[PDB]
């Protein structure tokens, strides 16, 4: 599924990530559109073998299990493949662990690079939320 930028908004808000560790909704909403451009089919392999999963483009060397990361950690408990569902449960809850894990949304190298101390509301602006 490729969403919306509000329906994404509004799902992420639903699933409670808005201010979740500080972080409000449109730094979320800019990670997801630099990460896999609003696609939860994206993936993307990294240079150590591990791949990228989804609509937040979560990594299989720690959050999940895709078969072909050996010696990897599975610390979301899932299968790297449910992060690619139209239902986006799966990422959210583990995006919720991950940035818990101290490092914040600096784990997320776009959002980093591309949202950190840039107008990030911009990216809610005109949705009903
Ligand atoms: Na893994």
Partial sequence: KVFGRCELAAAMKRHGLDNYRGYSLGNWVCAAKFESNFNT???????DGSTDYGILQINSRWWCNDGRTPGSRNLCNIPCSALLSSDITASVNCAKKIVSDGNGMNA??????????????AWIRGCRL
């Fill in 41 to 47: 089919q994206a993936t993307n392999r990294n240079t």
């Fill in 108 to 121: 997320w190298v776009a959002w980093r690079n591309r949202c950190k101390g840039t107008d990030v509301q």
